Design a binder for this molecule. Structure first.
Ligand code: MG
Ligand code: MG
Ligand code: MG
Ligand code: MG
Ligand code: MG
Ligand code: MG
Ligand code: MG
Ligand code: MG
Ligand code: MG
Ligand code: MG
Ligand code: MG
Ligand code: MG
Ligand code: MG
Ligand code: MG
Ligand code: MG
Ligand code: MG
Ligand code: MG
Ligand code: MG
Ligand code: MG
Ligand code: MG
Ligand code: MG
Ligand code: MG
Lengths: 122, 48, 215, 114, 120
RNA sequence: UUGGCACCUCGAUGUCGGCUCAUCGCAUCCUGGGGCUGUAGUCGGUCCCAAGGGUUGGGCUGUUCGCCCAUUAAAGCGGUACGCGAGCUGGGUUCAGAACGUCGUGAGACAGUUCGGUCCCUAUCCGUCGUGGGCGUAGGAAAUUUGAGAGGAGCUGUCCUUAGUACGAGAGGACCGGGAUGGACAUACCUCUGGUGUACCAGUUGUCGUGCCAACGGCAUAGCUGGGUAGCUAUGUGUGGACGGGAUAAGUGCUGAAAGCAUCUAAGCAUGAAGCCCCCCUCAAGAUGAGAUUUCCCAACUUCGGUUAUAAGAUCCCUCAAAGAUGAUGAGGUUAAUAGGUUCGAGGUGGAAGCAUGGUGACAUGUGGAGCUGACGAAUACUAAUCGAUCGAAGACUUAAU
């Protein structure tokens, strides 16, 4: 569950460090989001140098929420923090060096570029 | 919050047609005594 | 076609093929007999009626419902049978099968069939407006004295009355409801149960009516 | 004995070959993944946090730190997608539910042996 | 279970004061709904008496109060000793029950249904 | 809308915006069906039919209004005392205080700013939501039903194929069809993920007490803390609405005269919208028009004026919950498992007391997956559902077939 005005951590080297959501896009009346959904957000904290600068309005994809996902066999997965990767709207990333583990469920979001760059996919 | 008209004698009497009371159970004390209440114990005026 | 009666037992889960997990309601459908065949000539519509669960015979000083009475005895004797508790009618079936006095066994359904289930709901008692209907509640601070009441109930003096169908509080309660397009997943013959995929209305040891899907 | 018809129906779908464990033990779970064409197996190693439920609907949960990030993972006990479970190390704890490990870090979140 | 119109801490105290005096006097008179509830409390306490070991002697002392009985022939025993001494003898063959409830009429000040509960 | 008139209301019609809850119109924002186009295609413009459903979250302002940020298929215009204060706020403004600017000789004022400033009422009638008693329905009862009528539901996107085809210089890029998956909404349910869980288990602080140790109890928000059954639950798990038939709207037509031509019309025959009626779900014979099928039961006195006892069947009374404000509903009443207890289990907690051993001691290990256990499951008449009482029919006349 990720609403508007939730802080997320950014998990690549694109320059941003923390971000907060403006809309959960999708359909009208949409309220929350999970792993594999795309949100639109503003950077609140940045690394000096880097591509993105503080105050930019970007689009991003959710990896690893805290309340995770149910799978068809009745298995679950859960993480300790919320994370996020800024995309170029091709469903391709801005940075190059995704950090931390990434959930499997965005394989079928056509995010294969993100899956290949990452460490352990569980 | 306050009644707009008084209530007549008929409308008062139609209202309390169910404001009644019922007769009790009334079994008997078969050994010795007068009537007791049903599923109770005939202690006084009763031996059951 | 394919009507049967039974009562709810509980709810479990079953691992399907390739490890998929599916929630399952188990229904015991035991000792159903055909009890009267109705006809368009005699009655005006074709149907059969089915009795579900048998009960004890006639006794002289019965004080409850688990003994049949004399009207129920003679009705359940004209078809050679024991007196039943629940009796319903099924007018979707073909009436040219089902001789009177047959036992409709539990394996008239095969795994894979789509069905509809009918029962009465749980029942909640006297309930207010935000529980019984899905109403939004008022603010809980900032000086409000409006929390769980309903809102306005009409206009001012044009329409100096309240229209009907206004959604006030009252008895939430259990009334009849059907769910559609379920499935039969596994039929057990020895225990005489049916496993259906999903959940059905009613409390435990209730009464459900299973019949085939109309769509 | 939940209800006589419930255990009679779901008896056949209940595995037998699993070892015994209680929370605080370290387990290696060989789970098998159907890929696009193959049936590749993968191992998940962690510490058992809890066990709950009864009968067919039993469930346990193991916890792992992958890349500085804690990962919980939760399974049905009798599922056919778990191939094998090994008990790597016995533990010495005093709770039935080990939820206090969620708010620890470093070497402070360690469990003794036996 | 019932609430008896009391708070959780008051209901527990009223229910073990009531169960003690049923051991002392062996038949008491009270209302209907209170006697339905002390029915199950006092019979779980005779089950502790029929076992008779130390650990259930410790467990029955969680519930009973500290009351002395002026027994006959000028002897004196506590309420706990009387439970493991005499009541455990009378019911060593019976497998439950141990109590009965006899109804009476209402009281005068209320319409409260009086009830005698006795020890059998 | 701003106004004109001054007809009700001055022995009070008592308030701008916002909240909650709605209902109607259509001069239609989206979706549906068509015509014309200066419509190649994809997009658009304009007009016609159409009111079934749907018609967003924030920043600044008391604000209506308006500007902006992001989305959406779309972010429509109006009525209902500028809908709704005996349903809520009270920021604004016609109250008493105070201050700035301006005017005034002055007391004071502006309609110009600013800070602060008390929102009453136990619902009689109509009305609405839910639930019961009485009588009736040409004998009396139990059970299953028909359905005159009424209510509900009615939304929509993205992707993949057709096909990089048609069209086009190219750039670009389809109709018509066929599949998959979502958003919002509505209903049912607790196997799962989670919440709660004040008569469940465990640890722990202070003080008083059970004569002392040891083990226990009371009070401190349930003393606090960690877990947690049943049941009640959503943020969780299932399912629903894009179907089909008939008649139509705008419109397109066939044949065809009046008017030797032509003409969709005058007579005749077709087609055509998510709108109309059916189809789906629910209530429904107090439908005084009171319906239908199956089964059960049948009296004498008699001044038949009514009395008496009664059948089938119900109820009083008692034990209860799958139901419940009460009442009704349902499970049961000794030829009995309705509740309680007892025994055995499930699940929950997590290794009791006592004893022994090791250790200076705090403590640890063993006996032993121990002991305790509310609501859940099965068995068992040990306790209690005793004995009894009440109500309850006796098939009207006319006519025609028989
Ligand atoms: Mg009167
Ligand atoms: Mg709200
Ligand atoms: Mg206390
Ligand atoms: Mg005017
Ligand atoms: Mg005037
Ligand atoms: Mg004049
Ligand atoms: Mg007046
Ligand atoms: Mg129009
Ligand atoms: Mg702010
Ligand atoms: Mg107004
Ligand atoms: Mg008003
Ligand atoms: Mg002043
Ligand atoms: Mg001056
Ligand atoms: Mg002040
Ligand atoms: Mg202020
Ligand atoms: Mg002010
Ligand atoms: Mg459960
Ligand atoms: Mg002392
Ligand atoms: Mg001590
Ligand atoms: Mg004290
Ligand atoms: Mg607690
Ligand atoms: Mg029960």
């Amino acid at each position: 569950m990720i609403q508007q005005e939730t802080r997320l951590k950014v998990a690549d080297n694109s320059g941003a460090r923390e971000v907060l959501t403006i809309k959960v896009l999708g359909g009208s009346g949409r309220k929350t989001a999970n792993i594999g959904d795309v949100i639109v957000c503003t950077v609140k904290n940045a690394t000096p140098g880097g591509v993105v600068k503080k105050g930019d309005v970007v689009k991003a994809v959710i990896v690893r929420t805290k309340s995770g996902v149910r799978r068809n066999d009745g298995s679950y997965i859960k993480f300790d923090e919320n994370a996020c990767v800024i995309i170029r709207d091709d469903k391709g990333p801005r940075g190059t060096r995704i950090f931390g583990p990434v959930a499997r469920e965005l394989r079928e979001g056509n995010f294969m570029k993100i899956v290949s760059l990452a460490p352990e996919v569980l | 919050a306050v009644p707009k008209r008084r209530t007549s004698k008929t409308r008062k009497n139609k209202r309390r047609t169910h404001f009644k009371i019922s007769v009790p159970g009334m079994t008997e004390c078969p050994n010795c005594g007068e009537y007791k209440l049903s599923h109770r114990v005939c202690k006084n005026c009763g031996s059951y | 076609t394919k009507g049967i009666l039974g009562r709810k037992i509980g709810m479990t889960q079953v691992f399907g093929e390739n490890g998929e997990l599916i929630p399952v309601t188990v229904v015991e459908a035991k000792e159903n007999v055909v009890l009267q065949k109705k006809t368009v000539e005699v009655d005006g519509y074709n149907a059969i009626q089915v009795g579900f669960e048998d009960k004890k015979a006639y006794k002289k000083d019965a004080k409850s419902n688990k003994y049949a009475n004399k009207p129920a005895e003679g009705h359940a004797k004209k078809a050679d049978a024991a007196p039943k508790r629940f009796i319903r009618e099924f007018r979707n079936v073909d009436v040219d099968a089902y001789e009177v006095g047959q036992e409709v066994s539990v394996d008239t359904f095969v795994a894979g069939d789509v069905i509809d289930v009918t029962g009465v709901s749980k029942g909640k008692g006297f309930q207010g407006a935000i529980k019984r209907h899905g109403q939004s509640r008022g603010p809980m601070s900032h000086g409000s004295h409006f929390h769980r009441a309903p809102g306005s109930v009409g206009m001012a003096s044009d329409a100096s009355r309240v229209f009907k169908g206004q959604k006030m509080p009252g008895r939430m309660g259990g009334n009849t409801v059907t769910v559609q397009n379920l499935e039969v997943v596994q039929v057990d013959t020895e225990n005489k149960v049916i496993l259906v995929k999903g959940n059905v209305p009613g409390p435990k040891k209730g009464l459900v009516e299973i019949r085939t899907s109309i769509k | 004995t939940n209800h006589k018809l419930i255990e009679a129906v779901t008896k056949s779908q209940l595995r037998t070959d699993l070892p015994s464990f209680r929370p605080g033990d370290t387990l290696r779970v060989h789970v098998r993944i159907i890929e696009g064409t193959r049936e590749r197996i993968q191992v998940f190693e962690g510490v058992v946090i809890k066990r709950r439920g009864g009968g067919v609907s039993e469930t346990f949960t193991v916890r792992k730190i992958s890349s500085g990030v804690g990962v919980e993972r939760t399974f049905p006990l009798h599922t056919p997608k778990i191939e094998k479970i090994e008990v790597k190390r016995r533990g010495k704890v005093r709770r039935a539910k080990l939820y206090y490990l969620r708010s620890l870090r470093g070497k402070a979140a360690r469990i003794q042996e036996i | 279970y019932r609430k008896l119109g009391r708070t959780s801490d008051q209901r527990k105290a009223m229910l073990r004061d009531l169960a003690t005096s049923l051991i002392i006097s062996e038949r008491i008179e009270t209302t209907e709904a209170r006697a339905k509830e002390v029915r199950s409390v006092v019979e779980k306490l005779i089950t502790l008496g029929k076992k008779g070991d130390l650990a259930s002697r410790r467990n029955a002392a969680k519930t009973l109060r500290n009351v002395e009985i002026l027994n006959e022939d000028e002897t004196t025993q506590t309420a706990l000793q009387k439970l493991f001494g005499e009541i455990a003898e009378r019911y060593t063959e019976r497998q439950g029950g141990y109590t009965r409830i006899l109804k009476q009429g209402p009281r005068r000040g209320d319409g409260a249904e009086s009830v005698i509960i006795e020890l059998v």
